[PDB]
């Protein structure tokens, strides 16, 4: 098939489609005249074409006419003296024809014109080094460095003197280089040199210069702390290698005294002391270092409550005087911004709970603890949105601890008022049960069932409540109310379960007749289900009178099945009669059930 890509390939192939020799000077002149006219025409119309300038100069080089080539390069430099390739090409053209002095004059002009272009200095340097003009290279580096260049030029000068094995020259260069570039990597380059190319007297003297310098010039804040720290650590480790551990120890002590604000220096002393020191001094420094580490992690991320827990452990373990302050930071720093019980709030509340428990145990400051509860409940927890049930239950337990039980019930009622909660109600119920003021617990239960009316869980509790109180009549009334029409918010299965619980409770009280009445009511609620009839038969059996009651219940089940006009109901009734015969009857009733069995149904 034709394609646009194919069409365009054919266009490309469709479009993609004499070597004269010069026999004498006259033909060469004609050729050169024509070429020069061409190049001059282009450069006249567009003098900014630096590439064309270079090509025209190279054309003159190929004619061996260096005077013309030089003139072309010069004219190009007149157009744009900043174009480094032009300068480099001109210098190379000069060197290729061995005109080393023209090249020198030109390289000197280049560095005089553009002294900040490193390429020109490196060109001059490499040219003189190729000619083994070591002293010229040295004078070049001396001038370059005197012009205060970047670190690259100083490093190159050091490398040059190292090539010359001129160790005193390298000392003198470093002596200037640390002034031009005070960064601590420059001093550490000098000490690194003296270690491999110098005596230990010099190495100690250069470290002492470094410290005396940062000490005297500290007021300028030239070096960052990390720089001074690396300088001191390097100096200490070097004295440790030289077996003079005492002088490294003195160095660390005096340096820490001079600059107490540098944590990195304390950590370096910890790193040193863990391998060259002793056991006793290591753990206090480790505790301080971990305090700093937790502080850094916590300031970077204030809602990292795992680290808050570890941080509080560390401070109360090693620095007992800072316990309270760090708590007052944990409360105010880690408080969430959101307005929901997400994981941050759930983990945050345990910092408050730990603060409360710590206060109560280690201080017994009831006034302060009451102040803490006031701050938490009234201010921090957004009650209109959510609340922690454990907080209010803990407040209740603490309040009862300090004999203000009426105020404990007052704050519990307040907790119910501002934000009802299932666990708040459950804990309130539990505490009031322990208080043994049982009459108040039922008034709690009514508020609970007002809060959420559908759950049978609350509905079932009055049963064993009034049973513990021994009020059979009140329990019966409560059970009747529970299954009444006013509780329509409960599901049908939940209502059946509550009715079953009430029936079991009534059976416990030996109220067989009331149990039978409730069983009939539950069968009415079960829409005369066959299982309801079976349960009624079982209840009659639990009421040889049991066998007669079972027979009467089987007859009632048969009558109910006939009333519903259901063959499946009749089969269920027959199965119930057979089961009663098998359990507490005889084979005669089983045969009767077989006679009442319908043919595959058609009852007979």
């Amino acid at each position: 098939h034709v394609s646009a890509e194919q069409i365009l390939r054919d266009v490309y192939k469709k479009g993609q489609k004499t070597n004269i020799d010069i026999l004498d000077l006259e033909e060469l002149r004609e050729y050169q005249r024509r070429k020069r006219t061409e190049y001059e025409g282009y450069l006249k119309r567009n003098r900014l074409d630096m590439g064309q300038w270079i090509r025209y100069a190279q054309f003159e080089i190929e004619q061996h006419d260096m005077r013309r080539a030089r003139s072309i390069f010069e004219r190009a430099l007149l157009v744009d003296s900043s174009f480094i390739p032009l300068w480099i090409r001109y210098i190379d053209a000069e060197l290729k024809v061995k005109c080393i002095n023209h090249a020198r004059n030109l390289m000197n002009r280049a560095i005089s014109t553009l002294p900040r272009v490193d390429k020109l200095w490196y060109k001059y340097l490499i040219v003189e080094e190729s000619l083994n003009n070591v002293e010229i290279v040295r004078s070049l580096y001396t001038k370059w460095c005197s012009l205060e260049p970047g670190v690259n030029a100083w490093n190159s000068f050091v490398d040059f003197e190292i090539r010359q094995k001129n160790w005193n020259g390298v000392r003198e260069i470093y002596s200037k280089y640390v002034m031009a570039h005070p960064q601590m990597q420059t001093w550490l380059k000098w000490v690194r040199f003296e270690n491999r190319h110098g005596n230990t007297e010099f190495t100690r003297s250069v470290y002492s210069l470094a410290i005396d310098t940062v000490a005297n010039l500290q007021n300028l804040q030239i070096w960052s702390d990390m720089e001074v720290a690396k300088l001191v650590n390097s100096f200490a480790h070097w004295e440790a290698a030289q077996q003079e551990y005492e002088r490294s120890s003195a160095l660390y002590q005096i340096a820490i005294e001079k600059w107490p604000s540098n944590q990195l220096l304390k950590a370096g002393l910890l790193d040193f002391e863990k391998q060259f020191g002793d056991i006793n001094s290591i753990e206090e420094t480790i505790s301080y270092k971990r305090k700093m580490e937790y502080e850094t992690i916590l300031s970077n991320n204030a809602y990292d409550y795992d680290t808050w827990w570890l941080y509080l452990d560390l401070i109360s373990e090693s620095f007992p005087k800072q316990i309270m302050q760090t708590f007052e930071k944990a409360i105010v720093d880690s408080r969430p911004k959101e307005l929901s019980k997400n994981v941050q709030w759930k983990r945050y509340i345990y910092l408050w709970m730990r603060y409360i428990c710590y206060v109560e145990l280690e201080l017994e400051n009831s006034l302060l603890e009451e102040e803490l509860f006031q701050r938490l409940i009234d201010d921090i927890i957004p009650h209109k949105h959510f609340t922690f049930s454990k907080i209010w239950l803990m407040y209740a337990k603490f309040l009862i601890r300090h004999d203000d039980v009426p105020k404990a019930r007052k704050i519990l009622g307040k907790a119910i008022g501002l934000c009802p909660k299932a666990k708040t109600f459950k804990g309130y119920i539990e505490l009031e049960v322990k208080l043994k003021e049982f009459d108040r617990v039922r008034k709690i239960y009514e508020k609970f069932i007002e809060f959420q009316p559908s759950d049978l869980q609350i509905w079932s509790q009055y049963g064993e409540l009034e049973e513990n109180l021994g009020d059979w009549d009140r329990v019966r009334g409560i059970y009747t109310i529970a299954l009444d029409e006013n509780s329509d918010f409960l599901t049908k299965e939940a209502k059946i379960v509550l009715l079953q619980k009430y029936i079991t409770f009534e059976t416990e009280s030996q109220e067989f007749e009331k149990a039978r009445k409730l069983y009939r009511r539950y069968l009415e609620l079960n829409q005369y289900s066959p299982q309801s009839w079976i349960e009624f038969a079982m209840y009659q059996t639990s009421t040889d009178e049991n066998k007669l009651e079972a027979r009467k219940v089987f007859e009632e089940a048969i009558v109910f099945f006939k009333e519903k006009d259901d063959k499946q109901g009749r089969l269920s009734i027959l199965e119930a009669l057979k089961d009663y015969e098998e359990t507490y009857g005889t084979e005669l009733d089983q045969e009767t059930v077989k006679k009442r069995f319908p043919k595959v149904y058609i009852f007979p």
């Binding site: 021994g470 009334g477 109310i481």
Partner: protein, 32 residues
């Protein structure tokens, strides 16, 4: 980018009566 529905999305006045019923309860004996 893996965009998900928020967590919790799923596929696809009785207080007066409760108070009245509670107030109709008989007085407790406190026989315990």
């Amino acid at each position: 980018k893996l965009i998900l529905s928020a967590p919790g999305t799923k596929q696809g006045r009785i207080r007066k009566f409760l108070v009245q019923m509670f107030a109709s309860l008989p007085s407790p004996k406190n026989d315990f």
